[model samples]
Target: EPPAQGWDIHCHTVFSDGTETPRTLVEQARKLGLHGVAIADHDTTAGWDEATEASEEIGLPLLLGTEITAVDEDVSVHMLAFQYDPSNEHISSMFANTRAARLRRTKRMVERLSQDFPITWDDVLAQVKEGERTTIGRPHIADALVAAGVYETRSDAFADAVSAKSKYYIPTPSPSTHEVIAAVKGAGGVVVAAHAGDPQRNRRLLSDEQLDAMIADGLDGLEVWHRGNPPEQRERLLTIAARHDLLVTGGSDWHGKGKPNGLGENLTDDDTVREILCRGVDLIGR
Candidate 1:
C-alpha cells in the first residue's frame, strides 16, 4: 500500500517529548486511515525506525522529521526539518549542540521544580532515556511535573511555571535564526518556522524584526497552519506570511494523549508536497 491519508506535519512521540509510544501512535493513524504521517520528534530521529516499522505493518507511509529547539534572540525558536539527511555531518554536530543545551535546561527545570514541588532528576529520567539519542526537551519535564502532582492538569502545569512564562524558565543559548536556517539547508531538510504567532504573555515571538531576520536567513516556508494560534491569530499570521512570500505548511502539534486535541486536529486544508503522502509524523493524525 502507498500509505494512509492526510499528512500531520508537526507532532511528538514518547521517544522524545510526548506521552504516547511509537507503536500506539501508529495504531491510531491506522484507525484514522491516514495515508501519510511524519514522526517529527524533538531534535532527534531516534524514533523514526520504529515509526516506520509500525507504519509498514499498518500500511501507513512515514516521513522522517525533527524539530530543532534552538534559541534565536533569547527566545526558543522551533525549526521544522523534514526529509532530513541522516548522514549530514554538519547537522549531526549541530544536533549535539542542541542536546547539550537541552541537558542544561532540564537540569535547571528540575532545580526549579525542587524548590516548590519535590521532583528528582530520577523522576524526570524515569520518563526519558539516557543519551536520549534524539531531541529530548523540556516537555518531557512538563509531562513529568504533571504526573508528579505539582499540578492537576497539563493545562494547569503547563501554564503554571513550566511554560515559557514561568520564573523557573531558562532560555536556551539558541543558535541564530540564520544559523538554524543554514543548518537545515545544509542537511537537505525543508525548514518551516513554527507558530509565528505571539507567544506566551502576548510577547512577540515572531516580531516584524524577527520575521525579517528569518526571511533574511532564508526561511523556506511559513507555518501558515498551526494549533496554538487562535482563529484571529492564525489569520493574522497567514496574512503576514502571504505579504512576505513564503511556502505554507500546517499540523496539529499533537501530543497523542493531550486533552481537547490530538492527531488530525488543527489540520491544514491544503498541502502541495509529496511528503504529506509519506507522513512520518508519529504524533499527529488526519
Candidate 2:
C-alpha cells in the first residue's frame, strides 16, 4: 500500500533556489492531496507571506520554516527548523550573514567558471527571477549552463562545474550545528536532522556518534522518510529516534522542477505532526 498523504515538511520555492513560485508549490500540494506543505526555502523566509496566503485559499495547513545550511565537525549538514518567529534576532542575524556570503560565493564561482567554462555572470543572472537576485545559488548557475548549451541537463552541469567536488565549487561558511540548534530553539522553533540517511552530504549518517551528538545538541526530530535515504540508515535513525523520544519528520525535499522529487514523495504521519506541534506548544513556555 502507498503511504498516506500527510505533511511534506521540507520543500523550497523560487524565493530561494527553487524554480517554482510559492503559489505553484501550494497548488501542486493541493493537487496531490497532501494534508499540508511547508515551504522550507534555503536560508530565506521570503516566500512565507505568499505561501501563507495561498494556503488559506487552498485550505491546507501551511508551515513556515527554513532549511538552514549548517556545519557539523567541518561537514555540511542541512537543518529543518519549523515555526520559529521569523523576526527573531538570532535567526535574522544568522541569515543576514549567510545571505551576503551567498552573493560573494556566486561572484567567486563566476570568476572561476569564466576561465574554463566561458559562462558569464549575466548568463547566471539570466536564470534568476527578477526578485530572486539576492538568493542565487548553484541551481541558477546550472540553469545558466543549460541555457548556454554547456550541459544537456542540470545534473550534468553539477557533475562538471557546480557540484561540491567541482573545481569551481567553493565552500560557503555556515553556522555550527550546535549554534543553529540553540538559536532555533531560542526562537521557539523545532529542529530536525534532515535527510539523515543521505551519506553523501548528510553528517547524520556519518556515524552513530555524529547522530548522537546532534540529538544531544537538542535536535527535536529525525527525517526518516526521504527519497535519498538508504533503508539501513533510515532504520537506524528510526531506532535512535525511538530511544531518544525524537519526533519523526518526512518530506520530498522538493526543489520545484530543479530536482526530480515530487509532492508527497515521503510524508510525516499525522501522529508525528501532532507530536511536533506539541513540542512547539511545550517550547512556548520557555
Candidate 3:
C-alpha cells in the first residue's frame, strides 16, 4: 500500500554520452533509492556490460538499455530500447547497423559544420576518445563544440549552432517507422518513440494518426509520463497507448549536471509506473 519504487529505463552516463561516470550515476540513483536504473547510453552496449557489472556490485538492479538514433518520418529522433535480450543475434545486428549509421551520419555532420565552424573531424574524433572503440555521438560532438570555443556551453551549441536552424547544423538519415519497428522487435527491444514530439517531418504532434501508424508497426511504449509532458497531454498519450496496449515509459532524460533535469526528478505514480516496467519486462525477453 506504500508507494511503489520507481524504475527508470532512460538515462545516460560518461561511459557513452553524458556528464557523469557509470559509478557516479548508479550511486546517485541509489541515494535517491530508486528500484532500478538503466544507463541508456547512445549507440553502444559497452556501457551496458560495465554498468551491469557495477549494478551487481553496488546492489542496484540495472537493466540493459540503449538510446539509438533512428529516423521517425525523416527527422531525427532518439529511440530508447530497453530490457532487450543481449544474447539475441538479430538484436545484436540491429544495434550494429544503428551504431554504424550513427558514425556515418556524424562524419557528414562534422563536414557540414566545418564549412562555417573551425572544428574538424579530428576535433570531434578527439571527443570520441572518451570511450575508445565504442559508439560515439552528439554528446561527444557537443563536448567537442565546447572545447573548441564554438559555444560557451553545450546548451548554447544546441540552441545557436548545432540546432537544425543553426549555421553548423547538418542533417542525418534515420530509419523509417517500419525499419525501426522491425529492428527493435527483431532485437527483442521494447520500442518507445521517445519524448513528446511529433514524428519527424510530420507537423502533426503526437496525432492520433501517428500513434495509430506506429501501433501498426509495433511500438511497445509511449514516453508520455515525462517532465516535458503536461498532465493533459500525458493523459492523451497514455490514453492512446492504452487503446493500443503499449508500454507507458517515462524518465527525466538527464544529461548529467549540464541539464537541469535529473534522474527520477520527474514523478510517476506507483501503479502506472510499475505497469510499464512489467510491460518492458515482457517486451524485452528473448
Candidate 4:
C-alpha cells in the first residue's frame, strides 16, 4: 500500500527525463494533498531554480535534489542527493564532467541506432523539449523513434533499441559509489541509494557487503520503499538499514507521464523527512 502521507522525494521533470515542468510537479503534489515533494532530476541540478520558484508560488514544501548515477563494482547505482550546496565547486565539476561524458555517450548511441533506424541525430535533438538544459538521454531517443513511426511508444523503443543490452547501447561512465558519497558529503548534502534492490534494472544488485562498505564511507541512507524494490528486497534493505542505524527513506521515482509510477506511490515518512532536513543543508525555497 502507498503511504497515506509524506513527501514524494523522487521526481523528474522536463529538465531531465519527465514530460512535465517543475511547476507542474509542485502543482500536482499540491493537488494530491501531498505533505511535500522534491525535484530529483537525473544527474543535474539544472531543474532546482524552477522547482524553487514553483515551490514558493505553490506554497508546498520542496526539497532540491539530483539523482546521480554512480557505479560500484560493476553495479549501476542511482544516488539521490538532497539539499546540497549547488555552488560547491567539487560537486558541480563532477556533474559537469558526467554531463559531458553522457552527452558523448548518447551521441554515439544515436549514431549507432541511426545506422539501423530511420531516425537521425537531428530527429533526436528535435525530440528534446527543454533544449540543451535537458539530460538528452535514451528517453529523448525513444521519443525520436516514436516520432519516426519506428515504434508505437517510448516503452517499445526502450524495450528494443534503447535497451541497455542492445548493441547500440553503451555503458555510461560514472564515479564510484564511494566517490559519490564523499562528493555529496563534501557538498553538505544527504545521499541515499535509490532503488538499490531493483533487480529488473540490474543483473547484480548491490550486496550486503557493498552496503556496509558504503556505510563505512559516509553513505547517508537507503531507499527501501521504491516501486522497483520487491517485498523480499525491501525486508532485506530494512534489516540492513536498521543494523547500520542509517536513515530509511522512500520515493515514487515519478517521471510524470514518462513512466507509470504515480506521484506519492511511495514516500519518506514525516519523521524521516525531518531527519533528512536536519542532516541536509537548508531547503532551497523555504
Candidate 5:
C-alpha cells in the first residue's frame, strides 16, 4: 500500500545517476501530493541549488542530502546524510577525494570496456547530462553502451558490462563507515544507514555487531523502509531501532527514469522526519 502522508526523502537527479532534472522530481512529487521530497544525489551536493530552486518554485518542502558510499570491512554501505553544513571542510574534502577516485576508476573501466564494446571515453562523456557537476560512474557507462546499440537498456548494460562482478568493473574507492559517521556528525547532519538489509546489493548483509558499532559511533538512524529492503529485513531493522531508540526512516530511493523505483513508494513518517530535522542543521530552501 502507498503511504498516505509522509516524505520521500531519497531522490536523485541529472546531477547524479537519475535521468530527469531536479525540477521534474519536485513537480512530480507536488502533483502526487506528497508531503515533501528530498534531493539525494550520490556523493555530491551539486544538485542542491537546482533542487532548492525547484522546491521554492513548486512550493514543496525539500530536504537537501547526499547518498555517500562507504565501506565497512568488506561490505559496501550507502549512508544518507541530510541537512548538513556543506561548507564543512571535513565532509567536503571526503567528497572531493571520493569523486576524484571515482573518476579515475570510471575512466579505467571505460578503457577496458572499449576493447570489447563499441563505446569509448568520449561516448561515455556524452552520456553525462550535467557534465562536471554530475557524478560520472557506471550509469554513464551503461548509457553509452545503450547509445552505441550494445545494449537494449541501461539495466541490460548493468547486468552485463556495468555489473560490479563484470571483468571490466573496478571497485570504487570510498571512505570507511566509521569515517562517514564521524564526518557527517562533525558536519552537524543526521546520517542514516541506507538500504542496509538489501541482500541483492551484497552477498552478506551487515551483521548485528556492525549495526551496534555504527549506532555507538553516533549513527542517527536506519533506513528501514527502502524498496531494496525485504519484509524480514525491515522487521530486523525495526528491532534494532527499538533496542537503541534510534530513528526509523524510509524513502523511495528515486532515480527518475534511471531506475524503476517510483517516487514516494516508501516514506518517512512525519514524526521521524521531525526528529531528523530537530537533530540536523537548518533546512535548505525552506
Candidate 6:
C-alpha cells in the first residue's frame, strides 16, 4: 500500500495555544513540502482566512479545520472537525459562544491569580494583541505571567498557575460530545476523535464501549497516530477504527517553539486521506 500524501492535518496556530501565527504555520507546511496543511486551532476558525490566503499565495492546499473541546460525564475530549463549510452561520455562532465562555473562564482564573500574583486581565490581554484576544487562551495568560517576570517559561506558569490541576484551575463549559458531533454534522463537517489512544495525560480517553457509542452517534474518524500515543495504543485505536469502519488520521500536534515534535513528525497516509474524502461525508458541498 502507498502512503497518505495530502496533509499534515492536525496542527495549531497562534489563534490557539500554538506559538506561531497562521501565516507562519502555512509557510512551515510549504517549507516542509506537504501537499496541504490544516490549521485546526482550538475552538476558533479565525485563523482559517489568513491560513487560506497564505496557502493560496504560496500555492499549497489547505483544509479548514477546528479542534473543539467537548465533555462527556464531566470529562473532556478533543474533537477534530475538518472540511466544513466556512460560511455556515450555525457553526460560526457556536465558536463565538465558546470563545466568549473561554474568555470568562480566563477572567475568573486571572482573579484567582491576582490575589497572589501580580498578573492581571490587562496583562493577559496585552499578551494577545487587541485584535487577537477573541481567541486568547491560557497560553496567552502564561505569556503575560512570563512577561511580568513571574515565571521563566510557559511550562512553569502552566504547572504552577494555570494547568488544570493548579489551584487557579477553572473548568470552562464544553459542549457535550453528542452535541458537538451533531453540530459538526449539521454544519456539513466530519468529526474525528482526536488523541483517543492516549490514556495517561487524557484521563477522558474513551473506552472501546464509549468509542462504539460514538460510532453509533456518527463519528466519521479516529486520530490513530499522535505524538502523545504509544505504538501499542496506536494499534488498539487502529483496531477500533477498522472495526468501526472509521477513517484514520494522524499528525504531529505541533505547537511550534518549545514543543517536542516538529512539523511532519507524523503524517496521514495518502490512502487515509483518500478514504476520508471518499467515505466520510462531504463537509463542503461538492
- Candidate 2 has its poorest 10 consecutive residues by lDDT at 277-286
Candidate no. 2 TM-score: 0.93
Query: Residue 99 in model 4: shift from native, Å?
Result: 0.5
Candidate 4 ranges with C-alpha deviation above 4 Å:
283-286
Q: Per-residue CA lDDT of candidate 1, range 1-286, in tens? A: 1113466667788767667777777788667755456777777777777887898788866667788765666566787787756667877788778778878888888888788877878777776743455455676676678778776666676687777777887766667668878887776667778776636533556667777778877676766666566677667767766888766677678777644467866444335345332332223331
Q: What is the descending lDDT order?
A: 5, 4, 2, 6, 1, 3
Model 4 residue 218 CA deviation (Å) reads: 0.9
Q: What TM-score goes with each of the models? A: 0.84, 0.93, 0.83, 0.97, 0.97, 0.90
Candidate 5, residues 142-182: lDDT per residue as tens digits?
Answer: 99998999988888888888997789989998999999999
Q: How much does each candidate deviate from the true structure in C-alpha RMSD?
A: 4.9, 2.8, 3.6, 1.4, 1.4, 2.6
Q: Per-model C-alpha lDDT, please?
A: 0.68, 0.82, 0.68, 0.89, 0.90, 0.78
lDDT of candidate 3 over 58-158, digit per residue (tens): 88866667777665553455677776666677666766776777678777778887778778888887766454645666656777889988788877776
Model 3 residue runs over 4 Å out of place are 1-5, 198-204, 267-286
Q: Which stretches of candidate 2 lie over 4 Å from their true place?
A: 130-134, 202-204, 281-286
Over all chains combined, what TM-score does candidate 3 have? 0.83
**Stronger candidate by lDDT (1 vs 4):** 4
Pairs in steric clash, model 6: 3-270, 4-269, 4-270, 5-270, 188-283
Model 1: per-residue Cα lDDT at residue 133: 57
Give the higher-lDDT candidate: 3 or 4: 4
Query: Can you tell me which runs of candidate 1 are displaced by over 4 Å?
Result: 1-5, 129-131, 243-245, 269-271, 275-286
**Candidate 6, overall lDDT?**
0.78
**Alpha-carbon error at 255 in model 2, in Å?**
1.2
Residue lDDT tens for model 4, 165-257? 899999879999999999999988999999999986588999999999999989889999898998999999998989989888889988877
